[PDB]
Curated annotation (Swiss-Prot):
Gene Ontology biological process terms in this record: electron transport chain
GO CC terms in record: periplasmic space
UniProt KW Signal keyword: yes
Keyword annotations from UniProtKB, A to Z: Electron transport, Heme, Iron, Metal-binding, Periplasm, Signal, Transport
MF GO annotations: electron transfer activity; heme binding; iron ion binding
Main function: Electron-transport protein of unknown function.
Taxonomy of the source species: Bacteria, Pseudomonadati, Pseudomonadota, Gammaproteobacteria, Enterobacterales
Shown chain mapped onto the complete sequence: 23 to 127 of 128
Localization per record: Periplasm
Protein's name in the database: Soluble cytochrome b562
């Protein structure tokens, strides 16, 4: 054929009033993405992925709104076949890229949290570029067969060319449509969950190690205070020196050196077979312990947590982009009693509101 006659079919009476929210959302998304890209023109990998996400999102949003606005206002409902194929390919490819970018952001957050000292040496401009190129190539390759398969084989009740909607004009295309969903979207869920469980599993042992060190130094010291033999004092002081060394390594800096020096001075006296002097030195060390042990451990608990609050903003994007997808999937498989115009409005909203929400969050 030459042209397709697009048509909200139920609400065909009033159409001007429906276009106000869509125009407002498009303007907001365009302005937000433009500002986000302009502000960078912060050289960190996470910001690079955020910029790529914003650019892909803006280009996706600009590829669907104008046709709907023109249909609503000017009532020009004719689309060339080439335009329909182009719009289909662009929409699907950009959704895939957005998912890939989210996955890359999750990986960057994981490598930041679990390895804070090797974050720069692992992520290099070359490796980041290779990852981005791989994501783009995977999305393009997986989205390339759709136009060819459709071209292998005149009213659309919609506002843009959707592959599932166009295919109704059967039992084979749906298999590939389901396979691609579980390769660029289904795998993203699994990888993000695995990258979040590993992050949350990390905070648990780093804090546990410091807690263990504090408990063992305190507990052991009580034993030294209640000490009765030349051997026991030495056996406890050696463990004290080891624990202090490890705790200072794990990192209020000098204070660890002072505690270590006090432990060393106590060890020498016990080496010379004096019990009272060792007990006195141990009691003296408790002063520096209370002076620096109390303050370091107080900040230690608050310290581990701050790194988990940098990952909080990235959870909102997932919640705002995946949950609408799940709602759309549920309404596209069990939504029979609802009239079709509700289906059209819901699909438009689920496709359009992530572009609105993303720039406002970041």
């Amino acid at each position: 054929p030459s042209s397709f006659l697009l048509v909200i079919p139920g609400l065909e009476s009033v159409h001007i009033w429906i276009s106000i929210p869509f125009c407002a959302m498009y303007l907001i998304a365009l302005l937000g993405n433009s500002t986000l890209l302009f502000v960078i023109k912060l050289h960190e990998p996470m910001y690079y992925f955020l910029a790529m996400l914003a650019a892909t999102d803006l280009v996706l949003s600009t590829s669907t709104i104008p046709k709907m606005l023109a249909i609503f206002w000017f009532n020009l409902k004719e689309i060339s076949f080439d335009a329909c194929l182009t719009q289909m390919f662009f929409i699907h490819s950009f959704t895939g890229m957005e998912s890939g970018v989210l996955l890359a952001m999750a990986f960057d957050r994981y490598v930041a949290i679990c390895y804070p000292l090797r974050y720069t040496t692992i992520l290099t401009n070359k490796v980041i570029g290779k990852i981005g190129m791989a994501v783009v190539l995977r999305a393009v390759l997986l989205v390339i067969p759709f136009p060819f398969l459709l071209k292998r084989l005149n009213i659309i009740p919609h506002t843009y060319c959707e592959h599932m909607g166009v295919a109704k004009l059967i039992k084979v295309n749906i298999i590939y449509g389901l396979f691609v969903a579980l390769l660029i979207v289904g795998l993203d869920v699994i990888l993000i969950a695995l990258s979040y469980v590993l992050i949350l599993r990390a905070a648990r042992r780093q804090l546990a190690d410091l807690e263990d060190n504090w408990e063992t130094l305190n507990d052991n010291l009580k034993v030294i205070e209640k000490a009765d033999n030349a051997a026991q004092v030495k056996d406890a002081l050696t463990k004290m020196r080891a624990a202090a060394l490890d705790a200072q390594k794990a990192t209020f800096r000098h204070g660890f050196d002072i505690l270590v020096g006090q432990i060393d001075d106590a060890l020498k006296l016990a080496n010379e077979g004096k019990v009272k002097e060792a007990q006195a030195a141990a009691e003296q060390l408790k002063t520096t312990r209370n002076a620096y042990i109390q303050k370091y451990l107080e900040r230690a608990r608050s310290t581990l947590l701050k790194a988990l609050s940098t990952c909080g903003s990235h959870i909102c994007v997932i919640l705002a982009f995946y949950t609408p997808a799940f709602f759309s999937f549920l309404t596209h498989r069990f939504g029979h009693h609802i009239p079709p115009y509700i289906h059209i409005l819901l699909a438009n909203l689920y496709l359009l509101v992530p572009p609105m929400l993303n720039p406002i969050i970041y």
